[PDB]
């Protein structure tokens, strides 16, 4: 299927995913498109932070849904 990942500046990223893909798998696709390692990625959908263990199906993410990318670049 197809989902969108919107950055902080409005940049929209189109990913080809599957409801069985895990959040770690989705971040790997974001890196392929944007060069951002998954450890520096935070994904938010419906105001909830997506954990690496679950899948897109666990969060009720369907085709054409929009995820938000937050960069975890500052530790303190």
């Amino acid at each position: 299927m197809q989902i969108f990942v919107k950055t902080l500046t409005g940049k929209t990223i189109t990913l080809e995913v599957e409801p069985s893909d895990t959040i770690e798998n989705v971040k790997a696709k974001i890196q392929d498109k944007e060069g951002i390692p998954p450890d520096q990625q935070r994904l938010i959908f419906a105001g909830k932070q997506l954990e690496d263990g679950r899948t897109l199906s666990d969060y009720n993410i369907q085709k054409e849904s929009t995820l938000h990318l937050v960069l975890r670049l500052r530790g303190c």
């Binding site: 902080l8 890196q31 670049l73 500052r74």
Partner: protein
Amino acid sequence: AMGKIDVNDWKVNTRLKHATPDSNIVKWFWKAVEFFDEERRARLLQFVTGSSRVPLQGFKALQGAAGPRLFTIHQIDANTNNLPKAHTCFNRIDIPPYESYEKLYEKLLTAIEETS
């Protein structure tokens, strides 16, 4: 009070960690700062320190959460896909050994523009 960040004051009061003034990522960092307009310089200063304003006595008086912390560029042994890391509670930026000025430039711009 001039509205420009004093880059010479910034450079002279910057400590280097696991790098020298001859290190590529240091020379590329300051070249990027030189080509950053004022907005990007302020966005960079706040990215690393938590605010875009310098103390009245300049970068030599820079404070961290727990006391005096000079602005520090730290070259890290990390995978070069990593964007620069910032630790605002002690004003340090961690930079992987990027392969070109172009890569550091884009990574740094992405870090300060896609944060907060």
